[PDB]
Amino acid sequence: ATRRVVSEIPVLKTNAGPRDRELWVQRLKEEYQSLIRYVENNKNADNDWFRLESNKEGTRWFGKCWYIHDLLKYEFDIEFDIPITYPTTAPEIAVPELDGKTAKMYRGGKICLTDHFKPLWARNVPKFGLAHLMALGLGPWLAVEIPDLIQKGVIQHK
């Protein structure tokens, strides 16, 4: 299932936040390394669905994600800020474009995962990173919402 994907994703080994100077960097490198690998596994599995970058300090992240429905490719901008309590506190993913077009979402376009998410994250700290947040967060979210929003006529391709 989705757990399999997580298996192929390299775990992080540094408990530090975006304010731990020297250690944040080490964690940051871990983060980039885990993301690139995740991207490679997705490409190998013909499921390349996103690209993620950050600013210099690694406190602000932006990027994009896509979902192919009937051969068409629907791209959406994504972004999020690293909470000061990270990695103990997963970030809040947001897709601005969809703001106010689907109940299953927060103010400002922040995504809202299933109740079974937060606990899973907490008991894995600090092994889970952004790649995980992306695999367990955005991913399943997009899989369900995008095709539903498209069939309902809420979102169109252009």
Query: What are the sequence ranges of the domains in the chain?
Result: 1-158
Peptide bond into 91 cis (omega under 30): no
Task: Give CA–CA dist 43/103, Å, rounded.
Answer: 31
Please check whether residue 67 is in contact with residue 146, taking contact to mean a CB–CB distance below 8 angstroms. Answer: yes
> What is the stated resolution of the deposited model, in angstroms?
2.5
Please check whether residue 52 is in contact with residue 134, taking contact to mean a CB–CB distance below 8 angstroms. Answer: yes
* Residues belonging to the chain: 158
Q: Output phi, psi for 119, to 5 deg.
A: -60, -45
Q: Which residues contact 134 (CB under 8 A, 6 or more apart)?
A: 35, 38, 50, 52
DSSP state of 96: G
- Residue whose tokens read 């298996």: 7
Could you tell me which residues are beta bridge partners of residue 73? 68
DSSP state of 94: B
Q: Hey, what amino acid is at 119?
A: P
Active site residue 112: yes
DSSP secondary structure letters along 103-157: SSS-GGGB----TTHHHHHHTTTTS--HHHIIIIIIHHHHHHHHHHHHHTTSS--
Architecture per CATH, 1-158: Roll (3.10)
Q: Which of 112, 120, 125, 150 is catalytic?
A: 112
- Residue whose tokens read 């299932």: 1
Q: Hey, what amino acid is at 94?
A: A
